[PDB]
Amino acid sequence: EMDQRLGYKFLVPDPKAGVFYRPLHFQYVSYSNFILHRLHEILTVKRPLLSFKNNTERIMIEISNVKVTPPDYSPIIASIKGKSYDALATFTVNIFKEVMTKEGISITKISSYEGKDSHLIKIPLLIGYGNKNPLDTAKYLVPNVIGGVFINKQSVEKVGINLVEKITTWPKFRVVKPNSFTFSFSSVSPPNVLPTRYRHYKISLDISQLEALNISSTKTFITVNIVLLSQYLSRVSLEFIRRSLSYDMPPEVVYLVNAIIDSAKRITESITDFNIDTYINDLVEAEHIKQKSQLTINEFKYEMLHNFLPHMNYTPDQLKGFYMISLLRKFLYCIFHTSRYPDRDSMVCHRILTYGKYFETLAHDELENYIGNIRNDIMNNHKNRGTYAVNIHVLTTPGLNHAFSSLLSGKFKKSDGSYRTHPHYSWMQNISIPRSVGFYPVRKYHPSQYLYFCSSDVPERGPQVGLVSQLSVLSSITNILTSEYLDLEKKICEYIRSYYKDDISYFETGFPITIENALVASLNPNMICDFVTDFRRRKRMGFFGNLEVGITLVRDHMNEIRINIGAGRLVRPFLVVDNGELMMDVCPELESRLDDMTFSDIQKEFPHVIEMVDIEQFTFSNVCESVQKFRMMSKDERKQYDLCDFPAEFRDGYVASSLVGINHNSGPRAILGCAQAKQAISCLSSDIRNKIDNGIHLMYPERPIVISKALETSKIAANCFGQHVTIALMSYKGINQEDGIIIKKQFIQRGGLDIVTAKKHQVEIPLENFNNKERSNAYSKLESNGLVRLNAFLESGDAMARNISSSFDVSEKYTDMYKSRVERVQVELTDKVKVRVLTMKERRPILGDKFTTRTSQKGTVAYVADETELPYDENGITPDVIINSTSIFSRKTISMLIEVILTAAYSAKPYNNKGENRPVCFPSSNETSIDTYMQFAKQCYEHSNPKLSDEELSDKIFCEKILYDPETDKPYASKVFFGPIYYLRLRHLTQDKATVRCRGKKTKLIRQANEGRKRGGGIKFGEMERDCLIAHGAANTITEVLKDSEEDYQDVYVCENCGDIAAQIKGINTCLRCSKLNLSPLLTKIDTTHVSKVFLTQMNARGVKVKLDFERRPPSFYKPLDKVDLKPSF
């Protein structure tokens, strides 16, 4: 059970490391890194804009003095007053020309601007833990607040998710067509290079044309044979490359290798006196002439061949050539063994964007647009005018404001889901949403998602099915600053070059070593294992100054060593296995010292017990699934493993940690349970009486006592999401069928599962209308000041504020079928009048309201039964809720029975041997035997009543009782499952869905009933309902349903000649078109819909003439008919 305790140690706070709330910690830091450090680096620039003469006459733009300050009011004040919560950033800009002189540097100012006192930049600020932001270093925390939200201009709370980056860390393979393949990859500059440079390359291979094995891009690089390019970069022979590409390959790949090399040699020999430099130069010049570049040939060539690989800038060329060779090797291997190469949907080849990265990218893009606009304006001014004058109004709008506002509005590049308005359904949502990860449109459950994302928490319907995942409680996403990045990279490179001096220059048969995909050396194969082991050891001791460095050893036949340090990687802790020895089992002091140590203390004082591992390293390792399974293996078997995993309860997310024993039920039920856990009503907010917002609040909350540790550390348990009620599993007169339930009247009367719904109303009124002096029947709740009275109840026709247009009332109206009480009123007076109102209503359960358990057994109230009508036990107890028993066993929700048993056991003995309140641990992904739980319950009951017979004790353990019919007072045939359980109320209420329409408004174009529940719209009679009516054979009924109302009839005449609707002039029906042509056609009455007339007129507008004829059947007469019998002859 030591592994469980070590796991628990990660979930609790770690003050020594600055972790005050683990679940959201990685998000806090993500934002803190942007606002405090990265923004300054992005803005502080000093760059040329234009150059003249020859590198001796250039305009320069500089930005400095960046300052950021927080607001002067708390977020609650911002909510009440209707303000926004933004930090203010200011900076100074200088534009000046510089002329290079032999005497030194000559400086001549042109323009300068400052934003010392102005809203130069407004940056939305993250509320954070305890309503505390990173700018304000106060010393007061609001309890039970975790934050993670923004407040926008209109005073609306916003919350966001994480997003998978578009750029991959592994090349993508694709079969263009039979025997024709491609291999595409990308290169990006390191973090400390501003602005960032990007390059995208594609390698094409076709079996029919092996001379055209070409690497290409779009308007940034030449199209050249990759083998010849490698020769040019590395200055090595073709035989060297042949030997390299086939050193440790299966024989079927060597044939393709030989064919490629021979094709390259043929190209080389096809030219007279071949020279590689001349070949490359000719290609470059041909590209130069093909494009209309105005640069000199030398400039074009230097630009092309110096920015070839941005991620490997400032390295010799031979390393670039060897990098190309390794890419080709992987390409060929993937050609012959595709299923063994990382797939494009694998998590191995992706990284994830957190809160701060959105802001960082937007700042980058906006700064670049700003500088570009300044350059264009200066160039235009020089072209038209002289002196190089910089226009004003182009250096005062950096454009960050609209970028950030749009970001919060829910738009981000080609995505539209990064941020959204916070739905205030439950407290736990503040954890659930910021820990979500979204993928671009893949819906299958890929194996690489396991153990880092929750298995059961995914959308169950809609367009997002299989596109949103939830982090496990032990997973995190990495952060790192630029200076830390540089220091770490330097230390790693120094270690490599110092401790392996003589064996890092193989380049033909060795394993290349890359850092962030940048090749830095090539290791002797015989020493791969040692290098990795010694590396990991030094990683765990803090030798490199960072414990989250990832190292991967790829060996199938691709033969690579990869090192990863960048931000956006998924990481988890694992137990270390060293030389077939579980370190946790050889550290006796740890067991005694654990209780007094934090997680970082364990890492510092007992290294080699736990290691932080990222997903790519995990995917290529050998990991034992459990400590128990490890202990059952022989030593030789143990020697094959690198890591050991923690128990399964740590593989669920925080939402799924609200459920109990999900691995004892069917999986679909787990998906449903995760879905409905977020809709349970809870203690939503400490500011119930202050915040002017929508919400639903639980009235007399109870803390669950059959729980998991994660539910306790996250504080979801402390904020409550249900109540303990007494249930019976039986059939009640055949009423509770198909998921209907029985509920007790007196339980409802006393406050059982009572809630309060709160709603926000907002209006804007012109000042004249508000002050207008005339009592309409809709103003009965108003005071003399024109505002609704406090504590009054509003009805479905009342107005909240006086709004008269001048002698007509034009105010908005309350439109709910239930009344509500006025809790708060806030008014702002300006050119207009803005009124905000908060109302509340308590809602005791009624017929149709929805409930559920923690095992996904949901139902609606089917009958409210009086206490005297319910069955009772020998102690006089009647159940609060009755649920039909069959559904428990047809859906296989076994853990519900175990939960009831344990809740009863706790009720019998709720305290420790020390007398302290003792919760019972029943985690999701349980792992504890049912017999052990039964023994625990038996001990509880034996402590309660020492003198019980065997039958009574068995009945108590199994929660079985004899119940009596209240009408006759006689027992039922057999005993009934009966006991307490934590029960949840869901947000679906009957009176929020009921609708009815008698008559109302119509749409103008087609003159049919309007749409909208709040606007009194009508229900739509669709065409499938029409199909059903036709299937019944009810022709008149469907005809009357589809026609216009009989009360809207009017006389309409149509011309039988041209089909136009006849006009009526001076009471005479006339066809204008035909009259103009001197014709006298017949006009006939029609009875059709308005929409038909609109459709026909539009068709006429498109040039199609529609003419109608009419039936003039000759008159018919009835004739007597002879009689017919039709009966048989019997």
Partner 1 sequence: MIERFISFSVIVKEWGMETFIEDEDNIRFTVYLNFVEPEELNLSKFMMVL
Partner 2 sequence: IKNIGNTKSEETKFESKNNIGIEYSKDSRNKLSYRNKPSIATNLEYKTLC
Q: Which of 1057, 1069, 1070, 1084 binds Zn ion (CB under 5 A)?
A: 1057
Is 179 among the residues that bind partner 2 (CB under 8 A)?
yes
Q: Which is nearer to partner 2, 338 or 935 (CB)?
A: 338
CB of 342 to partner 2, least distance (A): 17
Is 149 among the residues that bind partner 1 (CB under 8 A)?
no
The footprint of partner 2 on residues 193-212 (CB under 8 A) is 207
**Nearest alpha carbon to residue 159 among 185, 188, 193, 124:** 124
CB of 1079 to Zn ion, least distance (A): 7
Cβ pair 705, 449 in contact under 8 A: no
What counts of helices (H) and strands (E) characterise the chain?
33, 48
Return the DSSP state at 913: T
Cα distances (angstroms) measured from residue 973 to each of 13, 739, 870, 983 = 54, 24, 16, 28
Cβ pair 6, 610 in contact under 8 A: yes
Task: Pick the stretch among 122-130, 254-262, 1057-1065, 1112-1120 that binds partner 1 (CB under 8 A).
Answer: 254-262
Is 118 among the residues that bind partner 2 (CB under 8 A)?
no
Q: Which is nearer to partner 2, 179 or 380 (CB)?
A: 179
The pair of three-digit structure tokens given for residue 790, joined into one six-digit string: 């406090």
Cβ pair 870, 879 in contact under 8 A: yes
CB of 33 to partner 2, least distance (A): 46
Q: Which is nearer to Zn ion, 425 or 1053 (CB)?
A: 1053
Task: Pick the stretch among 163-171, 262-270, 802-810, 1000-1008 that binds partner 1 (CB under 8 A).
Answer: 262-270
Return phi, psi of residue 1024, to 5°.
Answer: -75, -35
Give the x-and-dash track for 27-66 against partner 1 (CB under 8 A).
Answer: ----------------------------------------
∠ Cα 125 45 309 (to 5°): 100
SS3 161: coil
The pair of three-digit structure tokens given for residue 1104, joined into one six-digit string: 């199609």
Is 338 among the residues that bind partner 2 (CB under 8 A)?
yes
Tell me how far the alpha carbon of residue 967 is from its chain's centroid.
Answer: 55
Q: Which is nearer to partner 2, 175 or 718 (CB)?
A: 175
- Round to whole Å and give the CA distance between 663 and 651: 12
The footprint of partner 2 on residues 622-681 (CB under 8 A) is none
Cβ neighbours of 397 (radius 10 Å)? 12
CB of 337 to partner 1, least distance (A): 16
Task: Pick the stretch among 296-304, 331-339, 545-553, 722-730 that binds partner 2 (CB under 8 A).
Answer: 331-339
The footprint of Zn ion on residues 1074-1093 (CB under 5 A) is 1074
Is 138 among the residues that bind partner 1 (CB under 8 A)?
no
Cβ pair 922, 660 in contact under 8 A: yes
Cβ pair 548, 571 in contact under 8 A: yes
Is 182 among the residues that bind partner 2 (CB under 8 A)?
no
Q: Which of 259, 295, 541, 1041 binds partner 1 (CB under 8 A)?
A: 259
* Dihedral over Cα of 170, 175, 176, 180: its sign: positive
Is 255 among the residues that bind partner 1 (CB under 8 A)?
yes
The strand pair at 706-707 and 920-921 is best described as parallel
Give the chain's length.
1130
Is 1069 among the residues that bind Zn ion (CB under 5 A)?
no
- 336 touches which of partner 2, Zn ion, partner 1, none (CB within 5 to 8 A by kind)? partner 2
Q: Which is nearer to partner 1, 267 or 735 (CB)?
A: 267
- 259 touches which of partner 2, Zn ion, partner 1, none (CB within 5 to 8 A by kind)? partner 1
Task: Pick the stretch among 79-87, 336-344, 654-662, 1042-1050 that binds partner 2 (CB under 8 A).
Answer: 336-344
Size of the site for partner 2 (CB under 8 A): 8
Q: Which is nearer to partner 1, 265 or 745 (CB)?
A: 265
- 338 touches which of Zn ion, partner 2, partner 1, none (CB within 5 to 8 A by kind)? partner 2
CB of 310 to partner 2, least distance (A): 34
- Give residues after which the chain gaps, C-N over 2.5 angstroms: 441, 774, 806
- 1100 touches which of Zn ion, partner 1, partner 2, none (CB within 5 to 8 A by kind)? none
Q: Which is nearer to partner 2, 334 or 627 (CB)?
A: 334
CB of 206 to partner 2, least distance (A): 12
The pair of three-digit structure tokens given for residue 1124, joined into one six-digit string: 């017919």
The pair of three-digit structure tokens given for residue 601, joined into one six-digit string: 């203390």
Q: Which of 258, 275, 780, 1037 binds partner 1 (CB under 8 A)?
A: 258
> Amino acid letter at 494?
E
- 1058 touches which of partner 2, Zn ion, partner 1, none (CB within 5 to 8 A by kind)? Zn ion
CB of 1073 to Zn ion, least distance (A): 5
Q: Which of 103, 117, 252, 916 binds partner 2 (CB under 8 A)?
A: 252
3-state DSSP helix/strand/coil percent for the chain, to nearest 5? 35, 25, 40
- 835 touches which of partner 2, partner 1, Zn ion, none (CB within 5 to 8 A by kind)? none
Cβ-proximal residues to 414 (8 Å cutoff; 6+ apart), any chain: 440
CB of 328 to partner 1, least distance (A): 16
- Round to whole Å and give the CA distance between 370 and 367: 5
- 178 touches which of Zn ion, partner 1, partner 2, none (CB within 5 to 8 A by kind)? partner 2
Q: Which is nearer to Zn ion, 626 or 1084 (CB)?
A: 1084
CB of 178 to partner 2, least distance (A): 5
H or E segment to which residue 496 belongs: helix 482-499
Q: Which is nearer to partner 2, 338 or 421 (CB)?
A: 338
What is the three-state SS of 297-339?
HHHHHHHHHHCCCHHHCCCCHHHHHHHHHHHHHHHHHHHHCHH
Give the x-and-dash track for 129-168 against partner 2 (CB under 8 A).
Answer: ----------------------------------------
Return phi, psi of residue 547, to 5°.
Answer: -95, 0
CB of 338 to partner 2, least distance (A): 7
- 911 touches which of Zn ion, partner 2, partner 1, none (CB within 5 to 8 A by kind)? none
In 819-949, which residue ranges form alpha helices assigned H by DSSP? Answer: 886-890, 895-908, 930-944
The footprint of partner 1 on residues 720-759 (CB under 8 A) is none
Q: Which is nearer to partner 2, 178 or 463 (CB)?
A: 178
Cβ pair 850, 859 in contact under 8 A: yes
**Residue showing tokens 């003095």:** 65
In sequence order, what DSSP letters do the residues of 804-824 get, joined into one string? EE--EE-------SS-EEEEE
SS3 789: coil
Q: Which of 5, 67, 266, 1085 binds partner 1 (CB under 8 A)?
A: 266
Cβ pair 209, 271 in contact under 8 A: no
- Round to whole Å and give the CA distance between 604 and 16: 12
The footprint of partner 2 on residues 414-453 (CB under 8 A) is none
Cβ pair 487, 191 in contact under 8 A: no
- 262 touches which of Zn ion, partner 2, partner 1, none (CB within 5 to 8 A by kind)? partner 1
Is 256 among the residues that bind partner 1 (CB under 8 A)?
yes
Is 1058 among the residues that bind Zn ion (CB under 5 A)?
yes
Please report the beta strands in 128-216, taking only residues with DSSP state E, as ranges in sequence order.
150-151, 157-160, 162-164, 172-177, 180-188, 198-206, 209-216
Cβ pair 854, 660 in contact under 8 A: yes
Contact residues for partner 2 (CB under 8 A)? 178-179, 207, 252, 335-338
Contact residues for partner 1 (CB under 8 A)? 207, 210, 255-256, 258-259, 262-263, 266
Contact residues for Zn ion (CB under 5 A)? 1055, 1057-1058, 1071, 1074
